[PDB]
Amino acid sequence: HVIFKKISRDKSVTIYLGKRDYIDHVERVEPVDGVVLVDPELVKGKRVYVSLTCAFRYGQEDIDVMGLSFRRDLYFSQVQVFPPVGASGATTRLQESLIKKLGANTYPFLLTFPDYLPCSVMLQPAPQDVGKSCGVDFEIKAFATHSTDVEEDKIPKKSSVRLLIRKVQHAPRDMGPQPRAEASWQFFMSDKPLRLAVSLSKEIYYHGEPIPVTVAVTNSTEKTVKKIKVLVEQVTNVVLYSSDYYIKTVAAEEAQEKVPPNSSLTKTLTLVPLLANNRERRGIALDGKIKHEDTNLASSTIIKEGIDKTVMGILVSYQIKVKLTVSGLLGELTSSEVATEVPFRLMHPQPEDNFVFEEFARQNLKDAGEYKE
Secondary structure, eight states: OEEEEEEOSSSSEEEEESOSEEEEETTEEOOEEEEEEEOTTTOSSOEEEEEEEEEEEEOOOOTTSOOOOEEEEEEEEEEEEESOOSSSOSOOHHHHHHHHHHOTTEEEEEEOOOSSOOOOEEEOOOTTOOSOOEEEEEEEEEEEEOHHHHHTTOOOSTTEEEEEEEEEEBOOSOOOOOOOBOOEEEEESSSOEEEEEEEBSOSEEETTOOEEEEEEEEEOSSSOEEEEEEEEEEEEEEOSSSOOEEEEEEEEEEESOOBOTTEEEEEEEEEOOOGGGOSOOSSSOBSSOTTBTTOOBOOOOOOOTTSOGGGGSEEEEEEEEEEEEEOOOTTOSSOEEEEEEEEEEEEBOOOOOOOEEEESSOOBOSSOOOOOO
16 A cells, blocks of 8 residues: 655655545535644644645746746645644544554544536646646645744745646546537538548546547539548636647547548547547646656546636547548539537546555656747
């Protein structure tokens, strides 16, 4: 059973957390429960707190350009973990288990997430993207503060520990039957219809789950569909400081067939939306830093009813795009092209129904494209 920890610089405070990532099925969010290991000596007269902060940030550090940055705290919560006070409530059988295996300088803390918060999502612009880097961070932070610092309004850095956790999006415990994500278009060319229909088994796919896209074309036209391309596009909309817009392809496939005049075809291609599908991890919405192994694509944004979408920071959504390259005519120079889209949601699977300590820092991807530091 792994447990993550990070030690203060001055060794006076040490945080212990059960997980690096906390689940959010639409109904509730795993609270953050852990323990702080204080050094009785280095922490005398001073009190130790633990805060949970969620903030949206905008701005990069690119040399020779006026520095520009924006921060908007979406949620803040602080709890005193020391000296012991019932500020955390009952104890977690995880906390108890830990307090024992650890010592008598181990105190529990518990921070909970409200329901009006987005999940982890961030990005970095690619070479030709006009926007700047931005994202939503979730920081857990334990810190020691004497009464002289409470006065002078400062929190000694040396005696503080910081952890950036992920709030990942999982599907609700139980949902009703899922209808198929269907749709059909009829493109008229010289009064002869070229019918197109695209459908998916369900409306909510999971990261890693193959998506079976079925394309059905009934070409009663005089032209020939030269090629059929199908891709998964990730549409991103920054909504807090700048209205940036990104739309990238995260998976794509094409059929070999062709659809001659007055003939039909029903083919079905399978795509798998994965960050790993491409080396360039810039210009797409991720749930973690580009340089980290465990980082995945951001899940579709779920906006609880009643809350203003702008509070979500960055809006992420997915769609399947079908591109039909249609042959011109007799003396064809160029060939036309019709495109169409079908929306679907993407997230992690439903939730589920001897300690080995390890460093919190996440391992880095070995060949993680390009990125700002």
